[PDB]
Design a protein around this ligand. Structure first.
Ligand code: 1LB
Ligand code: NA
Length: 302
């Protein structure tokens, strides 16, 4: 059993920071030393125990497009995770509110986000919650470089029976089959969530939900063998190639579903320059989509 080096020190969190309003619970804080603002996720050690989460942030937070860990504190009761504060709002939210947005931009956004997940998968890490509310802009520059994946609270590292850290490529140590099994699903679910992101970006509405009032039963009935709709209406002006990527990302059978690696090799991603640069015809109800998203993931987690 190796030592876990965490918390238990002199300087408290309150000493170096001051807590502003809300944004486990998230709140905007300020570093009173430099007067710089950050975000602090307060976790209840009597509930979660975010040892798995903090490990990922420390190790992978270096990634440009992954929310960066700026500090961490432990008072013995609660765990304080200080990260960079997202000033650009929700990615999908902002995009849907742009009257002028095209596939060329949609492919560049998904590329940056998928390239990020391909890295996490290769290190044996699965987010397991990819919903759009966790993908945010650090700033308003509008560039995909300002994109950040956030809230790894449900994230998981691949480990062997020994407790060792494992990567998908190196199999030489024993890992419980059902662990490798779930690891498969969890990785496929991440791509599925990204499939829901692309579908909404293109059309302007969610595939399995209309609005927040949709019953979980019907939402799950759709998500089930039930097939989504890639044609007519908002799909008429959408490129045929783009429709192909969406169907394979949302494929009902996980084993037939596309992998982050393959997604990046898709002509839609590979040849972006072929894609249309003109504004997409979409529904504008960003707030309604918000309700649909929450409702969709509420049925999943219940
Ligand atoms: C709250 C949260 C934590 C840190 C942040 N930095 N900028 C915005 C936020 C928001 C949670 C959500 N949503 C989360 N853990 O991401
Ligand atoms: Na980062």
């Amino acid at each position: 059993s190796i030592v876990q080096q965490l918390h238990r020190n002199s300087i408290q969190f309150t000493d170096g920071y001051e807590v502003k309003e809300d944004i486990s619970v998230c709140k905007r804080c300020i570093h009173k030393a430099t007067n710089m603002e950050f975000a602090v996720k307060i976790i209840d050690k009597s509930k979660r125990d975010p040892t798995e989460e903090i490990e990922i942030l420390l190790r992978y937070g270096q990634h440009p497009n992954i929310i960066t860990l700026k500090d961490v504190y432990d008072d013995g009761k609660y765990v304080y995770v200080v990260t960079e504060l997202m000033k650009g709002g929700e990615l999908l939210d902002k995009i849907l509110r742009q009257k002028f947005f095209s596939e060329r931009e949609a492919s560049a956004v998904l590329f940056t986000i998928t390239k990020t997940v391909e890295y996490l998968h290769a290190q044996g890490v699965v987010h397991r919650d990819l919903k759009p509310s966790n993908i945010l802009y650090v700033d308003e520059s509008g560039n995909p470089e300002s994109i950040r994946i956030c809230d790894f609270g449900f994230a998981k590292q691949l480990r062997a029976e020994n407790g060792l850290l494992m990567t998908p490529c190196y199999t030489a140590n024993f890992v419980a089959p059902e662990v490798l099994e779930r690891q498969g699903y969890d990785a496929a679910c991440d791509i599925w969530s990204l499939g829901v992101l692309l579908y909404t970006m293109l059309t302007g509405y969610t595939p399995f939900a209309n609005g927040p009032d949709d019953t979980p039963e019907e939402i799950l009935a759709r998500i089930g063998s039930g097939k989504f709709s890639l044609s007519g209406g908002y799909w008429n002006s959408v490129s045929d190639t783009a429709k192909d990527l969406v169907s394979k990302m949302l494929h009902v059978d996980p084993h037939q579903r596309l992998t982050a690696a393959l997604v990046l090799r898709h002509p839609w991603i590979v040849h972006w320059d072929q894609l249309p640069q003109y504004q997409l015809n979409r529904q504008d109800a960003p707030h309604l989509v918000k309700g649909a998203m929450a409702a969709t993931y509420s049925a999943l987690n219940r």
